[PDB]
């Protein structure tokens, strides 16, 4: 009965379905583009940036 917190593969597949369930409500809300105002809500830093990713890349114009 406790094998949904203690298992090593039910822990992935539960957290896959909640993260896909959070993705499906976020992808549908990103079908609304032009007069939508922007709030930088400052999401967290649980996963660090693996790439360098400088803000100025080049002149691609």
């Amino acid at each position: 009965l406790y094998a949904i917190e203690t298992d090593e593969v039910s822990r992935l597949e539960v957290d896959l379905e909640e993260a896909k369930g959070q993705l499906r409500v976020l992808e549908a809300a990103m079908a609304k583009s032009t007069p939508m105002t922007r709030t930088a809500e400052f999401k967290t830093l649980t996963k660090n940036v693996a790439a360098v990713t400088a803000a100025e890349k080049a002149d691609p114009l």
């Binding site: 709030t39 809500e41 400052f42 967290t44």
Partner: protein, 160 residues
């Protein structure tokens, strides 16, 4: 944040206690032009009625850190720092705070506090709107009021 700074409530939510703020986006404040809600809230626009403004803003602060994940099909109430109970209501991933209908899930803050974006402004339950400023009226005569009081001989039915 501007209403907090003017009203002096912002000192209260400066504190380190674990709070769960239900700060409404200004579209919620822009949505205060209901024909209905403008009755009970327009009177606060007057500059002397800061008194109720603290009591209406302090209903949005909840002692404790209630994240939306902590509201998995759970209905728990609590009173604000205003002093009156509010029912937080998370079912079908639709977390409610009175008449909130929360927009953004949570924002992690400094002292383990949480910030949820709501769609409207929660008015406290037993909040009566302040009346508009009126005219102190005085009775013009005194004989229209002695004639307005029933005599003892009237109360016993001795007279009409």
């Amino acid at each position: 944040v501007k209403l907090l700074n003017e009203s002096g409530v912002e000192k209260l939510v400066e504190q380190a206690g674990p709070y769960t703020v239900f700060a409404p986006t200004d579209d919620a404040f822009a949505a205060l032009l209901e024909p209905h809600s403008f009755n009970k809230l327009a009177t606060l626009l007057r500059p002397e009625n800061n008194d109720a403004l603290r009591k209406v803003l302090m209903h949005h602060v909840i002692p404790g850190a209630f994240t939306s994940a902590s509201l998995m099909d759970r209905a728990v109430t609590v009173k604000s720092l205003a002093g009156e109970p509010i029912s937080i209501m998370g079912l079908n991933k639709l977390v409610t705070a009175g008449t909130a209908k929360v927009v953004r899930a949570d924002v992690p803050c400094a002292n383990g506090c949480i910030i949820h974006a709501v769609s409207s402004v929660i008015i406290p339950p037993n909040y009566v709107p302040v009346p508009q400023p009126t005219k102190p009226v005085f009775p013009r005569s005194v004989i229209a009021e002695i004639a307005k009081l029933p005599t003892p001989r009237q109360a016993l039915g001795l007279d009409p």
